[PDB]
Symmetry: C2
Subunit: 130 residues, 2 copies
């Protein structure tokens, strides 16, 4: 199974100019945990990622949640749409993260894969198990 | 493999009167995503849960983050410390959640199990796949 085969929905993405609350709004609405911030010059080019974890920490620290999201963002960890799903599972495990950003050969955003997408189906489980 | 075998640290718990930001602070500190709210008269008894996802929604809705957490809380979805890990995975899948509250036979809080705990190690995946 390739990572593209498991991608059924578009990822949550926002311009790199997004506020913290704007990211939270899109994540809450789409019931997913990681948002991709995209370049001003290309909305399909990933620049950073913001997790619900980052927003949580912003709340803990009393940051202005209408301020910019980029300062709480981190560099994306990526796999290819062409990569076998075991590579996606390896990066989540080894980087201790619950998502990977799926990009194509040309570096454009294809989707985001969750550990939730890999762990529940028997066929994916058995593939990752062996 | 039992759920108790995969518990890492003591669970994040706060009394049921906790504010939203108090929950966020404790979760941020412990680097985990689910807090258990416990009964005022019994700190061992879970009454509700608040995850980073609930806090996310709170932010999106512009709630007073220094107001009570209970209104944004959910009923605890629990498993026993003696349950096989496939029971936890199934509860996560069927309730569309990424955590479960682990309790003992007397209903006391033992820990919180995450999807991270179940979904990385092969031996565990294998056991989830067999069920």
């Amino acid at each position: 199974i390739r990572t593209s085969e498991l991608l059924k929905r578009p990822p949550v993405s926002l311009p790199e100019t997004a506020t913290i609350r704007e990211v939270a709004t899109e994540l809450a609405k789409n019931r997913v945990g990681l948002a991709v911030l995209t370049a001003r010059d290309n909305p399909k080019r990933p620049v950073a990622v913001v997790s619900e974890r980052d927003i949580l920490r912003a709340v803990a620290q009393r940051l202005d949640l209408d301020g910019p999201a980029m300062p709480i963002a981190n560099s994306p960890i990526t796999v290819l749409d062409t990569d076998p799903v075991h590579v996606a599972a390896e990066k989540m495990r080894r980087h201790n993260i619950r998502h990977v950003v799926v990009v194509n050969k040309n570096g454009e955003l294809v989707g985001v894969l969750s550990i939730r997408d890999l762990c529940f189906e028997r066929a994916i489980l058995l593939e990752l198990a062996t």
